[PDB]
Amino acid sequence: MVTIRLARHGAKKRPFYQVVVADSRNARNGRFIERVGFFNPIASEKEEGTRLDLDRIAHWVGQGATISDRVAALIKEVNKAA
Amino acid sequence: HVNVGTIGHVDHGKTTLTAAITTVLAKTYGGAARAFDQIDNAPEEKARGITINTSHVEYDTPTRHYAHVDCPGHADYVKNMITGAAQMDGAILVVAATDGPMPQTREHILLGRQVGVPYIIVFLNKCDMVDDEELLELVEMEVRELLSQYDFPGDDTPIVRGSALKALEGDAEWEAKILELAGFLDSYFLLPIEDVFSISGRGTVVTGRVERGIIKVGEEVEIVGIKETQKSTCTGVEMFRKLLDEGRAGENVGVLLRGIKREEIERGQVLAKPGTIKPHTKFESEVYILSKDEGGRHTPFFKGYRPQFYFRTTDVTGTIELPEGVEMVMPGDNIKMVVTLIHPIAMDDGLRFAIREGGRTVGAGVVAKVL
Amino acid sequence: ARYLGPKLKLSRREGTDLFLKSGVRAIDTKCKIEQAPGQHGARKPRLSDYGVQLREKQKVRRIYGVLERQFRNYYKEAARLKGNTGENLLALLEGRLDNVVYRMGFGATRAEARQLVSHKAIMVNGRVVNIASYQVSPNDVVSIREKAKKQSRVKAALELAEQREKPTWLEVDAGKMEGTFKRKPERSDLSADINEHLIVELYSK
RNA sequence: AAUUGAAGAGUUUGAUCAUGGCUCAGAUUGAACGCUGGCGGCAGGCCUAACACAUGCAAGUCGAACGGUAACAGGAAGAAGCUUGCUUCUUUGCUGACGAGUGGCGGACGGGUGAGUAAUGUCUGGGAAACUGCCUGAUGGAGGGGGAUAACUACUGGAAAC
RNA sequence: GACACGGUCCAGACUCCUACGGGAGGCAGCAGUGGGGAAUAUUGCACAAUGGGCGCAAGCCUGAUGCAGCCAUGCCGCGUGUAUGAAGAAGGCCUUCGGGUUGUAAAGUACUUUCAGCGGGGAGGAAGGGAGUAAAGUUAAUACCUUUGCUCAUUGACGUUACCCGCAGAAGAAGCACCGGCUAACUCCGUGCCAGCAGCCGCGGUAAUACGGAGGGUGCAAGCGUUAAUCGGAAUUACUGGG
RNA sequence: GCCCGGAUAGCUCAGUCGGUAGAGCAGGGGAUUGAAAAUCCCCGUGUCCUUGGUUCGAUUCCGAGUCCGGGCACCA
Numbered sequence A: 001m002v003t004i005r006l007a008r009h010g011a012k013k014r015p016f017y018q019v020v021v022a023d024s025r026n027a028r029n030g031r032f033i034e035r036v037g038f039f040n041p042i043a044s045e046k047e048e049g050t051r052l053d054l055d056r057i058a059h060w061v062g063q064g065a066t067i068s069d070r071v072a073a074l075i076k077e078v079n080k081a082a
Numbered sequence B: 001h002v003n004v005g006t007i008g009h010v011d012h013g014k015t016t017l018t019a020a021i022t023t024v025l026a027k028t029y030g031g032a033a034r035a036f037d038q039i040d041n042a043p044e045e046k047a048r049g050i051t052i053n054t055s056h057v058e059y060d061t062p063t064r065h066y067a068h069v070d071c072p073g074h075a076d077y078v079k080n081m082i083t084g085a086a087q088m089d090g091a092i093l094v095v096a097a098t099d100g101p102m103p104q105t106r107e108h109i110l111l112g113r114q115v116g117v118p119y120i121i122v123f124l125n126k127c128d129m130v131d132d133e134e135l136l137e138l139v140e141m142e143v144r145e146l147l148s149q150y151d152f153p154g155d156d157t158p159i160v161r162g163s164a165l166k167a168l169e170g171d172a173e174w175e176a177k178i179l180e181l182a183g184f185l186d187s188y189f190l191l192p193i194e195d196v197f198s199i200s201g202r203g204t205v206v207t208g209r210v211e212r213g214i215i216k217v218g219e220e221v222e223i224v225g226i227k228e229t230q231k232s233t234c235t236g237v238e239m240f241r242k243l244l245d246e247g248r249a250g251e252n253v254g255v256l257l258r259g260i261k262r263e264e265i266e267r268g269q270v271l272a273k274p275g276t277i278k279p280h281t282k283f284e285s286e287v288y289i290l291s292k293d294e295g296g297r298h299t300p301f302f303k304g305y306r307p308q309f310y311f312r313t314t315d316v317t318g319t320i321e322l323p324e325g326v327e328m329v330m331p332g333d334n335i336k337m338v339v340t341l342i343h344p345i346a347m348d349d350g351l352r353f354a355i356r357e358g359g360r361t362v363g364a365g366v367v368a369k370v371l
Numbered sequence C: 001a002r003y004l005g006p007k008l009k010l011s012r013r014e015g016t017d018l019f020l021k022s023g024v025r026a027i028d029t030k031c032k033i034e035q036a037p038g039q040h041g042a043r044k045p046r047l048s049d050y051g052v053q054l055r056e057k058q059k060v061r062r063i064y065g066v067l068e069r070q071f072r073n074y075y076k077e078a079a080r081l082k083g084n085t086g087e088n089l090l091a092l093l094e095g096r097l098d099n100v101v102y103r104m105g106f107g108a109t110r111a112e113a114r115q116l117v118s119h120k121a122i123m124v125n126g127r128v129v130n131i132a133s134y135q136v137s138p139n140d141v142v143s144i145r146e147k148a149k150k151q152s153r154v155k156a157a158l159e160l161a162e163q164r165e166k167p168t169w170l171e172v173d174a175g176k177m178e179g180t181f182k183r184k185p186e187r188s189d190l191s192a193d194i195n196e197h198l199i200v201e202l203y204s205k
Numbered sequence D: 001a002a003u004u005g006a007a008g009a010g011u012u013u014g015a016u017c018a019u020g021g022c023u024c025a026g027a028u029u030g031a032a033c034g035c036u037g038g039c040g041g042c043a044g045g046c047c048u049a050a051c052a053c054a055u056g057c058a059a060g061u062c063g064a065a066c067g068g069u070a071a072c073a074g075g076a077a078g079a080a081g082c083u084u085g086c087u088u089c090u091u092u093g094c095u096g097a098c099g100a101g102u103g104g105c106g107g108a109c110g111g112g113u114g115a116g117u118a119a120u121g122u123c124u125g126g127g128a129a130a131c132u133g134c135c136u137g138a139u140g141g142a143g144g145g146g147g148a149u150a151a152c153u154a155c156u157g158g159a160a161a162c
Numbered sequence E: 001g002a003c004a005c006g007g008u009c010c011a012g013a014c015u016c017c018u019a020c021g022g023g024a025g026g027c028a029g030c031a032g033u034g035g036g037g038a039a040u041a042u043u044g045c046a047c048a049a050u051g052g053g054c055g056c057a058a059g060c061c062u063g064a065u066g067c068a069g070c071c072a073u074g075c076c077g078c079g080u081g082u083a084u085g086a087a088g089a090a091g092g093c094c095u096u097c098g099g100g101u102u103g104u105a106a107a108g109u110a111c112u113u114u115c116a117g118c119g120g121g122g123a124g125g126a127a128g129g130g131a132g133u134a135a136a137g138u139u140a141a142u143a144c145c146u147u148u149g150c151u152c153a154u155u156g157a158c159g160u161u162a163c164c165c166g167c168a169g170a171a172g173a174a175g176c177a178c179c180g181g182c183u184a185a186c187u188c189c190g191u192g193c194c195a196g197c198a199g200c201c202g203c204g205g206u207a208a209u210a211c212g213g214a215g216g217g218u219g220c221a222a223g224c225g226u227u228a229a230u231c232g233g234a235a236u237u238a239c240u241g242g243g
Numbered sequence F: 001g002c003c004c005g006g007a008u009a010g011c012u013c014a015g016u017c018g019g020u021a022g023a024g025c026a027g028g029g030g031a032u033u034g035a036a037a038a039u040c041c042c043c044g045u046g047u048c049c050u051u052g053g054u055u056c057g058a059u060u061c062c063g064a065g066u067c068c069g070g071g072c073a074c075c076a
């Protein structure tokens, strides 16, 4: 089953998250088919905090992919309305 | 470090005076408070063939680290001085205020005289029952008559009054007199290694009886011995294969160490308190040599005679530097010499050792100074 | 990483004044200069090929008080830049925080300038920064922390800057004691008594 | 805006030019040793024996599948001390939950090693004669019966395992 | 879906329990021990975060992971203070015994205080979830369930954190190789082809810039040298680019 | 922890059932030569590992300690 989850990168005591699309039977930083945007929870109070490429994501859910809890929280964080 | 010893009479309070110095000096200075049980019931140790009954007590002082020896029996004090099983320097004269100087207390001053025990710091015990200023001066006067006759200056030896029972419980009003007792000792954690093991899956298992300090699992500890000194950390204390976290003095328990192979720790080492003791290879001692029929020799030896010193866990050989005037030490002598060791090890003015050569008894001594 | 020693033996080694001991005296003179590099410094130099490359290489490092590894790192960082690598050098080396403080006049000497940057008294853009090797961004202000501003030392340092050059790639306020920055330092605007020609060659081999 | 890039010397010989090896000048390391050694940040830390192993631990979960409930905590009926509801407290699956058992799902993931392997492998580019739990799109269905077994009792083999 | 690391049956080997009939086991999973070896660390903490398994969910397991401890193993930042200071001292050393040099170095004096040690403030990593409630869907229903706002109590292993403020006093913090040419930087004394040096050419035979020490200077810096190993130099395997 | 064998001038060993320690290979001090060789003139430099006893007298007799090499333990 294809899933849309996160990927812990960056460094110790300074995380980073490059949200990707991979399989549930793989590693966290394992093999994936496509990555779609990222997430920086500890970046800074600046113009850029999180980039989510929604269009490609909706393209995967229609196939039958299930979204993760933290990932879906970002979808509401992007605020579909505004 | 300087080793002291409570010389006196039965029912005087020598064991509670020994318990007085070790407990309150461990609360305001450092060390470990000792229970009354271990000071009374001393363990048995075979010293050169004859079994002795002594208790080695230690406490920390701001300047040095003073030791303390205490025997429960009068018969054990005969062997303690005339031969020198438990090396002692500042012999604490314990005289009761209720009874006063009695024949057994008088003998210990003469027994220390003929041998060579230089310092005697007198502490008058059991003064919490009698309250009479004229009586305080009368018992103090019988003591001054008991030291002048044995070549000891009674005008410079300090006299400290007190009671050791409440000095053990915790009443602060009497504790100031115990501190000046140890203060007058200035003017006038440690763990001996007896056995070593190594079980499959844990590492190095060291066994020995604790003389001073409290052991926690996970603390930094140092190792001092005649070989190359190293550093380690406590990773476990076990007794009869049963877990015991709080390791107290007197307990002959087994300890687990961190990252050491079996070939680095042997018989003669000491688990000491971090950054508190330096090694010595040069010190001084005054010995006694016994007769052939009683174990020792019958002929004297020369200068350069290097016997084996067995100090609390060792069998280290040391070269002897005989003083001027002393050429041949014949059996029965109570003379001195300067001792030079071949290995760097913690040598204090009072650590006890048996002297053997030929695989048997030769003599025993009293460590007086560290040069 | 600094020298922290008899830091005037360096001036006698090359002869050129390094200004490491500017201080309260106009010209040093109490150093017996030009004729005492060492005890056997009376013997005339050989001036070898490897040496001519070396003698100015160490000299610039003795001026900036920079570690050789740090010098080599700045070398290759200058290698991956646009234009002349030799010119790329002095721009970045003039970018070191305490050196700009030295050009501002807030630091009597470079040693005094770095002793201030290390003690959190210096402040850039309202931020306390402690790294001496902080590359200054184009056109920014640098000042002193308020609770440690003008505490008898930098006070004496303000009179010293009056007799200095005060370059044209920056601007010092001296009223509130603000060290503002302008366009990147040009090679023709500096002391111009140093030759970077030979420095690029020593790391070429 | 995106590879702005290349150094030599010594040594054969009385001396020279050659051919010609040898050596050093640099960078690097999964490093070791000698010596010394203040703090911090980020990485790496069994290369030899794919040698043998103590002990704890490293994959279990679901009562919204079922029979049960051996325990824990309530309810409920009751029982006894006795302050007449203050308590003691024996039955009860009636609930919350839950050992052991049945069943479903995972255990093929994640983790480690590099022994084997010279092409049954890997990498590169294509391909057709396949399968595809879990998730998802679409069209329908989801009717009716029986026979056993573990748990659990009784007896019982076996040191244990079983 | 395995022809299966923490499954089964069988054989062999290495161990183990044994009531001797018969059974049990697999750290090349986290640690850890023996041994091997020139050489490589704790039987740590928490499921807060990501992810994986089950379950509607709540939760539960999670040596995956996230951190901590340990080692200078490497890279990178930083500190061991700065200014002033000439009788241009003592002492060391050399010496044409004049003096020079170590040397503004130190002492003395005036200031400052990162990181440490001590005592208090204090982020973020946290998104959710549990209970309550409004509305809208759904329905016979204001119910149940779902979704979207909101309220409440909160959930952090690291953690005596990051970072910031304050106190005290220059206070706690510098070595390593080298010094004839290659290749930056020297003399003296002692030892006399002896002791030893060494990458190569080579030095030492009683006047050694090369041995050992001393002083001085030189290179680098919490690293410095040495050894092992690859490439480069090597156009000494030359396609680029030789005969 | 316990039990044996080597611990003998630079090195390898002989000598013992008490009697003031040898040999070999060495090596070296001098004449000669710029220096060695060859030749010639002459040689032990020893704590018998350390220490002690039974002493007219111990390397050897009985013992121990420590270093090295060689065998077994014990398992908080």
Ligand SMILES: Nc1nc2c(ncn2[C@@H]2O[C@H](COP(=O)(O)OP(=O)(O)O)[C@@H](O)[C@H]2O)c(=O)[nH]1
Binding pocket: B009, B010, B011, B012, B013, B014, B015, B016, B040, B072, B125, B126, B127, B128, B129, B162, B163, B164, B165, B166
């Ligand atoms: N009143 C009084 N009695 C004492 C004091 N010290 C010791 N004792 C008593 O003396 C008795 C025995 O003393 P202890 O110390 O066992 O003597 P030892 O073991 O022969 O040294 C105990 O019962 C104590 O109560 C004291 O200072 N005051």
Ligand SMILES: *C(=O)[C@@H](N)Cc1ccccc1
Binding pocket: B195, B207, B238, B239, B240, B241, B252, B253, B254, F076
């Ligand atoms: C191990 O059991 C030690 N704690 C106690 C001990 C017993 C016997 C012999 C030696 C030590």
